[PDB]
Design a binder for this molecule. Structure first.
Ligand SMILES: Nc1nc2c(ncn2[C@@H]2O[C@H](COP(=O)(O)OP(=O)(O)OP(=O)(O)O)[C@@H](O)[C@H]2O)c(=O)[nH]1
Ligand SMILES: [Mg+2]
Lengths: 88, 90, 86, 481, 48, 83, 73, 97, 81, 87
């Protein structure tokens, strides 16, 4: 068994350029979709091609799309980071 | 200045193996056998009968609870007489 | 000196009025007497205003902006939403 | 005066999860009573009255559990010796240890056998110089054949520094030789099954101690104090990398099988034995100022009048500052020796003559505090005036209480023959500390008890049960020693 | 009334005392030649 | 001020009173023979009076030996000297 | 003193249940952790109060969002 | 059946596997790594450790000059071999005293 | 791109401050930044709920009250449909 | 410069304390900790809309405070001198 550090996972995302989905901190309907550009020891996320997704309050489907681009997201607001596996 | 473990965390380390009841700030109450404890109040428990304010009575086995999300433990009375509460004369 | 907090030093060096929005939903207007790296500030000539909706006989009334004058102020850092140097 | 609360210790008996019943056994003059002395001096405030002592008498070993006048005059133990102590682990949890100090002379091994009936585990104390001796072989063979769990305490480590005066690599080879001698005797007792019952320092069931200077450690506790002194160190991995043919490469910082780096030392020699050798050498070899700076470089600080003390007293103070208390011994016994529940199941399987599917056997298997009283008495201790005896045994069910109506059952008692049975009366319950007796009104199941007034019918061993079992059930006897 | 001495001083004093200092290190040297055995032999009217 | 009998205000407005035994740098309190005191603002409407009586009713609980975290403490108040 | 690694050694290669703030649930086999307990999992499924399943793949979860762990086995 | 060394590396690896590859923190040092194993006063220290009383001490109380028996251990020890009868009798009479 | 050089490259250029509550954004020029990445920013003008609320001036923004900060090079902040 | 030392210098002053949850405290300062917690005497405490009560002492822990109102006669400029040693 080999351990996987979360910083190693972030580095793997950075070198693979896999897009990620970020939930906001107890904003259950608000997410950010984008390809990772950089991170630090405080996991502050420099994100590229990022779009803001607002979910419906009744059934949690994406309601609005807000393209935003390159963002330094604060490390204190990440709830979960999903590695969006593209259909290759 | 070595980081001395506080007397409350020492009492929590004494409380492992006993039956403790934890009240969280996220609303859950657990009654269970404290298996594992840390210096930053992360606790692993076994028996955990569950009781919340909305009445979520349930029973299950094994849990890890982080120390930031908890309010307070209740520990057995006999742990009051632990050796840490007697003043070592220096 | 060279960081953002230097504007508070500029507030110290000029004694100008500063509008502070706090996490309680209130607003402050005061002259900066002292500050630190931790953004804990001491203020003088302080006028603090806020907005409240009085509920009269179970009916939500119109929002009213009221205020209070405080001579000496010790405002603590983390509750501040934002600082405006006017 | 003790450093714990006796009421807290009586509270600790009502918990057969964290209790350990162990016997200290070994060859003659290998350091069992000195290990008990270390534990007593950790738990009792008696060092003040030992320092009011002059002449050759202040150079005497304390020998707390040697109380017979024969024991005092001959300088060796002739009787088994029980104590109950509150000892703390590394994490800070206090446990109750019920420890029997057995004699080490061969002629008195029957006392050892009596202790081996009552304990959950055996700590075998082996002197590092003499190694395994004939009584060590006898104790190993008996404890293995009776399926008693076994731990190893290598004693008298200071001799390797102060008597043999051998370099630390040769001290490692001497330690490994003694450990493999113990494992060789264990394997020779049961051929093919010695891998399950194997003592090795990387397994955590081997303790290195010097009981004259009152210190002990495992590899886990020594890696733990490295982690405390530095931080970021994983204790269990560093501990399992501190024994064997494992060499540390300091520029590569890597543990290998061979010294791939020039001048690399063995990991146990590099990290453990050379610090202890240098601690001894610099403590006994340096003046007060040089020793003060040397000990201050490791955070060790003595009182200013203690740096000019005699070298043995100074060495003891420096050792107790460096190694600390006996938490490593507590960790070893907690991890490698079972609670009275598991050992109670094994004990009822091995030495009980009645059926195991009955209710009283379920009370004895679960160490039930609220069940009917069953005590297995294997020892008799004379009083101060030697008019009568106290019966020392193990409460395995119920609570031993003063003023209790009981049936003492001899070795010849059966169902068809009730000839060897006497109805008697328990008068006072004691916790035995072998120099004082704590008067108690109750001792729960799975614990050691010293009863008065039930001695007359006991010849060698006995089974003390209640006058009547509330389910209407017959009683049986334990097997003889 | 009280003295304390360093290691070189005690070593020098021990080296200067070698005409009149004991060379016995093992107490086992005094087996059956000590006060207790002398008193026991006195009690039994025997001589070691 | 060790062992002085004290009352503690909790984050959710509850009270935690009893015999304190210990505290640390993070203001976490070991508190013996603890009584938890809870207040609820009940609207006790009498069948004869149309005005619903606003009363902050008081309810009790016993816990014994407790250990409260300093991240949820608000204020520390004196209850009584030790008996 | 730096924070020690949390005692997650028993939970390697185990399907676990994670209760997160906002009453979110994440069910997945453990992959690894750090000294802060940011937790990386494989085969992650998100669960909402309505009771449906969302496929995620292998993900990471912030430590301050982590509230409760629970072994399924 | 399996060794401690052929559990840490693997049969004849003579190296930790690089997938696990445990490494100590760079700050971690042996407890007295800079200090020498011995000192020029260490042979004398061990020699004085085994010296008879009072030479194994380094502090004490002062005694009367007549309270120091300089030759008492001569007759508290076994007599040398091949003495005259008068010397042996003197040894035994000092023992008697 | 590491975060500290990323915000060092956005000094004295058009920046959006997406705050953390109240649906508030600020448009202006990022003047100065510390190791705690607090914000001193000039020529601030403030939008709430994607509608204009007005110009303020020289503003200190504490980083804990902020969702994030981005570059505003040709980016429109009206709610897209 | 740390403002905890200025909290040390303004002891024995009758102040008003506004908390992060909303309660109001008032009375004369007994002492203040280096971790900006403060114990105060001659205390009156008003919760959210219910009846205030007075206690002889109250040790309020400082992570839940919003701000203070000091007495207007406090010589702030005299307390502004730096008595801490220069490193
Ligand atoms: N060098 C050295 N000597 C020790 C040490 N511990 C004990 N001794 C000596 O070894 C002798 C052991 O005597 P005991 O304490 O009775 O040993 P025991 O294991 O109880 O053996 P029994 O008398 O048969 O029960 C004592 O005279 C001590 O002076 C030690 O750690 N180092
Ligand atoms: Mg003995």
């Amino acid at each position: 068994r080999v351990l996987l550090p979360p910083i190693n996972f972030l580095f793997r995302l950075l070198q693979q350029r896999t897009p990620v989905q970020i939930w906001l901190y107890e904003q259950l309907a608000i997410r950010i979709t984008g390809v990772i550009r950089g991170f630090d020891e405080f996991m502050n996320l420099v994100i590229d091609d990022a779009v803001e997704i607002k979910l419906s309050p009744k059934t949690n489907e994406p309601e609005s799309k807000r393209p935003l681009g390159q963002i330094l997201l604060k490390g204190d607001n990440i709830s979960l980071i999903q590695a969006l596996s593209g259909s290759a | 200045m070595t980081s001395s473990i506080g007397i409350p965390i020492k009492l929590l380390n004494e409380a492992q193996g006993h039956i403790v009841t934890l009240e969280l700030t996220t609303g859950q109450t657990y009654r269970g056998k404290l298996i594992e404890a840390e210096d930053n109040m992360n606790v692993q428990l076994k028996d955990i009968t569950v009781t919340a304010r909305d009445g979520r009575v349930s029973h299950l086995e094994q849990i890890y609870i982080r120390g930031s999300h908890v309010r307070f433990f209740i520990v057995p009375d006999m742990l009051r007489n632990a050796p840490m509460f007697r003043s070592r004369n220096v | 000196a060279n960081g953002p907090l230097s504007l508070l030093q500029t507030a110290v060096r000029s004694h100008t009025q500063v509008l502070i929005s706090v996490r309680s939903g209130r607003k402050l207007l005061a002259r900066v007497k002292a500050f630190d790296r931790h953004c804990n500030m001491i203020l003088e000539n302080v006028k603090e205003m806020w907005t409240e909706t009085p509920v009269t006989n179970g009916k939500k009334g119109r929002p009213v902006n009221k205020d209070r004058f405080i001579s000496k102020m010790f405002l603590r850092g983390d509750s501040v939403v934002i600082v405006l140097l006017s | 005066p003790v450093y714990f609360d006796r009421g807290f210790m009586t509270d600790l008996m009502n918990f057969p999860e964290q209790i350990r019943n162990i016997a200290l056994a070994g060859h003659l003059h290998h350091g069992k009573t000195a290990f008990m002395d270390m534990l007593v001096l950790e738990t009792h405030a008696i060092q003040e009255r030992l320092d009011k002592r002059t002449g050759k008498k202040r150079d005497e070993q304390l020998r707390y559990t040697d109380v017979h006048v024969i024991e005092r005059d001959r300088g060796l133990s002739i009787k088994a010796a029980p104590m109950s102590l509150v000892l703390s682990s590394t994490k800070g949890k206090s446990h109750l240890f019920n420890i029997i100090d057995t004699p080490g002379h061969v002629d008195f091994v029957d006392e050892v056998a009596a202790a081996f009936r009552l304990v959950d585990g055996v700590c075998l104390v082996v002197d590092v110089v003499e190694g395994v001796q004939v009584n060590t072989e006898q104790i190993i063979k008996h404890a293995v054949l009776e399926d008693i769990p076994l731990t190893l305490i290598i004693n008298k480590m200071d001799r390797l520094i102060l008597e043999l005066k051998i370099p630390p690599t040769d001290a490692y080879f001497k330690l490994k030789h003694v450990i493999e001698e113990v494992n060789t005797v264990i394997e020779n007792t049961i051929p093919g099954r010695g891998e399950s019952k194997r003592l090795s320092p990387e397994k955590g069931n081997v303790l290195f101690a010097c009981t004259s200077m009152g210190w002990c450690f495992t590899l886990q506790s020594f890696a733990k104090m490295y982690s405390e002194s530095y931080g970021g160190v994983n204790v269990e991995e560093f501990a399992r990398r501190l024994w064997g043919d494992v060499y540390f490469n300091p520029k590569k910082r890597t543990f290998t099988r061979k010294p791939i780096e020039e001048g690399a030392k063995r990991s146990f020699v590099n990290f453990v034995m050379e610090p202890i050798y240098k601690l001894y050498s610099h403590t006994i070899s340096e003046g007060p100022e040089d020793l003060k700076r040397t000990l201050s470089k490791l955070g060790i600080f003595l009182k200013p009048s203690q740096y000019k003390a005699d070298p043995k007293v100074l060495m003891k103070l420096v050792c107790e500052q460096f190694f600390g208390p006996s938490t490593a011994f507590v960790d070893m016994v907690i991890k490698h020796i079972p609670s009275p529940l598991e050992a109670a199941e094994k004990k009822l399987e091995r030495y009980y003559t009645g059926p195991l599917d009955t209710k009283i056997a379920e009370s004895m298997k679960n160490c039930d505090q609220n069940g009917p009283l069953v005590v297995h008495v294997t020892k008799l201790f004379n009083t101060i005036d030697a008019k009568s005896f106290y019966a020392f045994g193990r409460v395995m069910s119920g609570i031993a209480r003063p003023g209790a109506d009981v049936r003492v059952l001899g070795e010849g008692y059966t169902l068809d023959d009730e000839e060897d049975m006497v109805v008697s009366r328990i008068s006072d319950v004691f916790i035995a500390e072998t120099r004082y007796n704590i008067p108690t009104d109750g001792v729960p199941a799975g614990n050691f008890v010293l009863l008065g007034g039930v001695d007359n019918s006991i010849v060698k061993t006995a089974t003390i049960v209640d006058k009547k079992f509330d389910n209407g059930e017959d009683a049986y006897v334990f097997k003889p020693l | 009334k009280r003295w304390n001495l360093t290691l070189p001083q005690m070593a020098n004093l021990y080296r200067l005392s070698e005409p009149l200092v004991s060379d016995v290190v093992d107490p086992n040297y005094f087996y059956l030649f000590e006060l207790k055995s002398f008193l026991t032999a006195k009690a039994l009217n025997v001589a070691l | 001020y060790i062992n002085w009998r004290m009352r503690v205000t909790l984050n959710d407005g509850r009270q935690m009173t009893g015999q304190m035994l210990a505290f640390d740098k993070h203001m976490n309190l070991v508190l013996a023979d603890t009584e938890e005191f809870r207040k609820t603002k009940r609207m006790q409407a009498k069948p004869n009076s149309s005005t619903t009586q606003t009363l902050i009713q008081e309810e009790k609980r016993t816990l014994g030996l407790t250990i409260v975290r300093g991240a949820n403490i608000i204020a520390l108040s004196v209850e009584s000297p030790p008996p | 003193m730096a924070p020690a690694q949390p005692e997650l050694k028993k939970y390697l290669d185990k399907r676990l249940f994670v209760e997160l703030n906002g009453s979110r649930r994440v069910i997945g086999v453990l992959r690894g952790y750090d000294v802060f307990l940011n937790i990386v999992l494989d085969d992650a499924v998100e669960e909402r109060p309505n009771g449906e399943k969302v496929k995620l793949g292998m993900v990471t979860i912030r430590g301050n969002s982590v509230v409760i762990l629970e072994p399924l086995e | 059946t399996v060794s401690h060394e052929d559990e840490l590396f693997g049969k004849g690896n003579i190296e930790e596997p690089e997938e696990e590859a445990f490494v100590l923190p760079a700050a971690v040092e042996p407890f007295f790594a800079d200090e020498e194993l011995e000192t020029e006063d260490t042979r004398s220290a061990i020699e004085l450790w085994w010296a008879p009383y009072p030479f194994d001490r380094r502090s004490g109380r002062m005694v009367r000059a007549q309270d120091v028996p300089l030759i008492k251990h001569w007759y508290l020890e076994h007599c040398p071999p091949k003495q005259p009868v008068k010397v042996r009798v003197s040894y035994q009479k000092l023992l008697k005293t | 791109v590491n975060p500290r050089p990323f915000l060092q490259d956005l000094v004295n250029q058009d920046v959006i401050v997406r705050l953390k509550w109240g649906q508030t954004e600020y448009k202006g020029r990022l003047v100065s930044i510390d190791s705690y990445m607090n914000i001193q920013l000039a020529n601030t003008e403030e939008f709430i709920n994607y509608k204009s609320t007005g110009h303020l001036g020289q503003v200190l923004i504490r980083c804990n009250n902020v969702l994030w900060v981005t570059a505003a090079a040709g980016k429109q902040m009206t709610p897209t449909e | 410069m740390k403002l905890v030392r200025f909290l040390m210098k303004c002891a024995n002053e009758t102040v008003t304390i506004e908390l992060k949850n909303g309660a109001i405290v008032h009375g004369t300062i007994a002492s203040v900790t280096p971790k900006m917690d403060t114990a105060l005497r001659n205390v009156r405490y008003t919760p959210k809309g219910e009846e205030p009560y007075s206690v002889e002492s109250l040790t309020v822990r400082g992570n839940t405070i919003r701000y203070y109102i000091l007495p207007d006669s406090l010589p702030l400029d005299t307390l502004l001198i730096d008595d801490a040693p220069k490193p």
